[PDB]
Design a protein around this ligand. Structure first.
Ligand code: NI
Ligand code: NI
Ligand SMILES: [Zn+2]
Ligand SMILES: [Zn+2]
Lengths: 148, 147
């Protein structure tokens, strides 16, 4: 659903804002899972997430990973999927972000909600083998007032 | 479909590269039509393109617009569409582009084929009303050799 935070926000800061708005608890474990999911090449299984994060989180169980994933799914920031003939569920961080457009004439700035930059990081990794670290984006255009 | 021209190219630059590789002529009018199609915010008819471009092209007829659109359709950069209760053809630009990824450690550059930046432009227009002119995109990451 289309909305604004009156500023650009990356996927990570976006989720945290949305959760705070909904008065949802945000632990360090939850932040770590969110950050891992965002930065992830693949669509990791819960076990993958767990195995990669456990060493830095002593009180973490697999149950903790699944429980957090359920909340992120229910709040619409990750999606669950299965592939054919495979019993494991795979998780995909698909949370949106907010990016700026600048008027090339009057320099006025507006923001918009984006879900496509994620698919670019994936297309890049698939074709090139790079582990994608960041894809910083800003759009340029002509604001409605300058179109008139 | 996935391929490289060994350089980043935007949607416009990409179409010209593709046409060149097939030794297809590229006139000023063909360039103007490619650009128009890329920057259109609604699916234009041939007459819309014609009426908008003709003042800069005394050479141009409606035929020239249709002929150029046909070439662009045949080369995979535009598609035709029909709507209910209208006999007129409308056109959609569907060409991809090529963007770089830069390795943060060693600086090696590779490129990949992209179709999503155009969707970003569309979302920006729909939500904000701005006419999008450009979205410079460069990806950064860790190249296979460095990892
Ligand atoms: Ni948001
Ligand atoms: Ni190409
Ligand atoms: Zn302006
Ligand atoms: Zn490298």
């Amino acid at each position: 659903d289309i909305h604004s935070h009156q500023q650009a926000l990356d996927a990570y800061e976006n989720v945290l804002e949305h959760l705070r708005e909904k008065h949802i608890r945000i632990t360090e474990t939850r932040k770590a899972i969110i950050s891992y999911m965002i930065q992830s090449t693949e669509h990791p299984s819960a076990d993958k997430i767990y195995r990669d994060l456990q060493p830095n989180f002593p009180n973490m169980s697999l149950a903790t990973v699944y429980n957090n994933l359920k909340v992120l799914v229910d709040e619409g920031f990750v999606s669950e999927l299965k592939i054919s003939n495979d019993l494991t569920t795979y998780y995909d961080f698909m949370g949106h972000q907010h990016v700026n457009v600048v008027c090339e004439i009057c320099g006025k700035i507006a923001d918009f909600m984006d879900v496509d930059v994620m698919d670019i990081a994936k297309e890049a990794h698939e074709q090139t083998g790079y582990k994608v670290t960041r894809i910083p984006v800003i759009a340029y255009g002509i604001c409605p007032d300058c179109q008139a």
